Write a protein that binds this ligand. Structure first.
Ligand code: HEM
Length: 291
């Protein structure tokens, strides 16, 4: 399977920057969502879930095809709650009918992170919508009740090494778990719609106690009201992962620079970019544009 990036016909930087501005202006406007967290966290979860289905072995899944638009992947139990991010983006797709689905889902992720004061993520356009039958089967996304052994082996399918996995995990500073979506409940931290290295500082500094929650699942709860899932808690139980968590807890710039590289790799896995294709676009934020 080869997927070659085809730029939407006749579109260039300024067109894509208008879709970004539209997503960003609507993030501003709909600030009421989810107890005033806003839609930025469910949008980076949506760009990681449409990208996270990739298998490096046979090049299936990944962001290219925009197959979340189809019922099999839209209704994946692992994707519960993402319907909210989908419904956010739909008025934007109506407004800009020429952009492909995987391009819109992924750019929404880039927009959320840069507008939540995170790092600039380079983005590339060219994902082409493929048919209902290239849609991956359910079960390719990760379990929350597992250990660092599972984490390493799972992320190897998307060929992410230790550092990329820890950098990617820090997007959990954002938003929260919701009992009805995943059987887990609670924020990871206090500033959950601002992108910082808070996740690592909490993982290291709180007095976490293992408790069962109202859905009968274990989770690590802290005195401050925070929570950690069994899978990401084991990132302090693995000697290699823990040295990286401490690195990011101590250095936010490093975390942002690494996060930017890993999230872009995540969003481009499975896609071949021809030599003539446009370079990665670095989109301006509303603020930078005075808007
Ligand atoms: C082993 C890996 C991962 C597991 C087990 C996992 C699991 C989960 C679960 C159970 C939720 C809560 C869903 C809900 O109840 O609404 C969640 C939320 C979230 N995840 Fe992850 N996740 C993983 C990796 C990632 C990565 C790599 C990213 C992004 C690069 C990410 C970004 C998010 C964000 C921002 C939220 C908050 C969403 C919201 O507030 O609605 N996750 N994750």
């Amino acid at each position: 399977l080869v997927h070659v990036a085809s730029v939407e016909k006749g579109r260039s930087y300024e067109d894509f920057q208008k879709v970004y501005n539209a997503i960003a202006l609507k993030l501003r406007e709909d600030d009421e969502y989810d107890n005033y967290i806003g839609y930025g966290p469910v949008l980076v979860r949506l760009a990681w879930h449409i990208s996270g289905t990739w298998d490096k072995h046979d090049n299936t899944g990944g962001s290219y095809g925009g197959t979340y638009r189809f019922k099999k992947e839209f209704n994946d139990p692992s994707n519960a709650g993402l319907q909210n991010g989908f419904k956010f983006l739909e008025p934007i797709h109506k407004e800009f009918p020429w952009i492909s689905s995987g391009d819109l889902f992924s750019l929404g992720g880039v927009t959320a992170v840069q507008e939540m004061q995170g790092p600039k993520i380079p983005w590339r356009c060219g994902r082409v919508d493929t048919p209902e039958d290239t849609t991956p089967d359910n079960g390719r996304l990760p379990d929350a009740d597992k250990d660092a052994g599972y984490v390493r082996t799972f992320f190897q399918r998307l060929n992410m090494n230790d550092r990329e996995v820890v950098a990617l995990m820090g997007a959990h500073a954002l938003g929260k778990t919701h009992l009805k979506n995943s059987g887990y409940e609670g924020p990871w931290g206090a500033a959950n719609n601002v992108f910082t290295n808070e996740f690592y500082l909490n993982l290291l500094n709180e007095d976490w106690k293992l408790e069962k929650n109202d859905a009968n699942n274990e989770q690590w709860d802290s005195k401050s009201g925070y929570m950690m899932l069994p899978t990401e808690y084991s990132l302090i139980q693995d000697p290699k992962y823990l040295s990286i968590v401490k690195e990011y807890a101590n250095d936010q710039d490093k975390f942002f620079k690494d996060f930017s590289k890993a999230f872009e790799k995540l969003l481009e896995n499975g896609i071949t970019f021809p030599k003539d294709a446009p370079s990665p676009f670095i989109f301006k934020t509303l603020e930078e544009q005075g808007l």
